[PDB]
């Protein structure tokens, strides 16, 4: 049998890729972004369906021989009620009809868009959730405030801003005392533009006689109050107790501006 020149190959030395186990990489795969390959090591053929069900947002790619595979994110399936009412959760796990922040074997990953709070993807959900008993002061104030500085800066994120402002203008004209509307009026003031000031006066002038009699007596003084204020050189807002006791969010723009014209002596001026 012409005794062949046999020789065995050198003993194998596995790399880090070859020692990867996908069942330990839930915290590595979840933060992965689009167009990024996350190598998971050699994957047996019978475990492919187990991996593809755990990560439906990802595409399983056979990258090399011996079953070497990687995961490539294709989409974000995060729903509005699970991604929009928080700013710290980037993903969650679904198992047996329940939603959890912690991974568990047999659960399905679902991830939120990184720009979900930089665009307008949450405006519809939070417009209803920030009304009534579901109002969360922290989340809802941060949502309204973050709109005025919409990080998208895209011609679409800028238009979703105008759509939201028209909705809040219609809602808050019916009643400006609800907490989400008082927050909207406050953030319009802080924006300090000609459009935001114009929208403030529009909303406050649309209010009922009940609202104006309750919150806007600094803007609508009585006959005797207005007549007596003509006897002083300073603006009425600088001494009127109705203006010193007023909610600044319900002041007309003129009254708000006049409040800062009161010639404060060095120290405390009143």
């Amino acid at each position, epitope marked *: 049998s012409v005794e062949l020149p046999k020789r065995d190959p050198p003993p194998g030395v596995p790399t880090d890729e070859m020692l990867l186990n996908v069942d330990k990489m839930h915290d590595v795969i979840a933060p992965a972004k689009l167009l990024e390959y996350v190598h998971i090591g050699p994957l047996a053929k019978d475990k492919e369906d187990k991996v593809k069900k755990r990560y439906p947002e990802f595409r399983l790619v056979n990258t090399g021989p011996g079953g070497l595979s990687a995961l490539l994110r294709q989409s974000y399936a995060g729903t509005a009620p699970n991604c929009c009412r928080t700013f710290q959760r980037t993903h969650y796990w679904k198992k047996d009809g329940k939603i959890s922040d912690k991974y568990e074997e047999g659960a399905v990953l679902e991830s939120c868009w990184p720009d979900v709070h930089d665009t307008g993807k949450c405006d519809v959900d939070l417009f209803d959730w920030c009304q009534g008993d579901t109002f969360d002061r922290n989340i809802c104030h941060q949502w309204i405030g973050s709109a005025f500085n919409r990080a998208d800066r895209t011609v679409e994120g800028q238009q979703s801003l105008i759509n939201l402002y028209n909705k809040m203008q219609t809602l808050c004209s019916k009643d400006a005392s609800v907490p989400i509307c008082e927050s909207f009026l406050h953030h319009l003031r802080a924006h300090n533009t000609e459009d935001s000031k114009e929208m403030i*006066d529009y909303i406050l*002038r649309q209010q009922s006689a009940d609202f*104006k009699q309750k919150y806007m007596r600094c*803007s*609508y*003084p009585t*006959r005797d109050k*207005l*007549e007596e*204020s*003509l*006897k002083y*050189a*300073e*603006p*009425r*807002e600088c001494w009127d107790p109705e203006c010193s006791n007023a909610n600044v969010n319900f002041l*007309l723009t*003129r009254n708000y*501006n*006049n409040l800062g*014209l009161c010639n404060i002596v060095r120290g405390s001026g009143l």
Partner: nanobody
Amino acid sequence: GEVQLQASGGGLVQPGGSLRLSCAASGIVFSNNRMSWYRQAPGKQREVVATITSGGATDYQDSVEGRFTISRDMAKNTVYLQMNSLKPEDTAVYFCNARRDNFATAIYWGQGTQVTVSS
């Protein structure tokens, strides 16, 4: 004498129209006085409609807020009153009023101009 607060610009216009009243002051400097537009309905007491301080801060009567606007021209020493969306209850004689900053005795009232809106 010779403190002159003559009001003009009135007239007749259908409800919803607009008027612009004028009051070219003489003998009075605006940087010293508070200028206030009054009005007096037939058979009723006079009431202040708008006002502007010597610094330029304005204030209005509630039933005219948003519709009327009082402004100043320091060079021309003339105060103005833009009237928009005139309602039938705005029919009155509108006249000027100058009040000194810290001299209560130096108050002067001017001759009015007729404002009438109807159909």
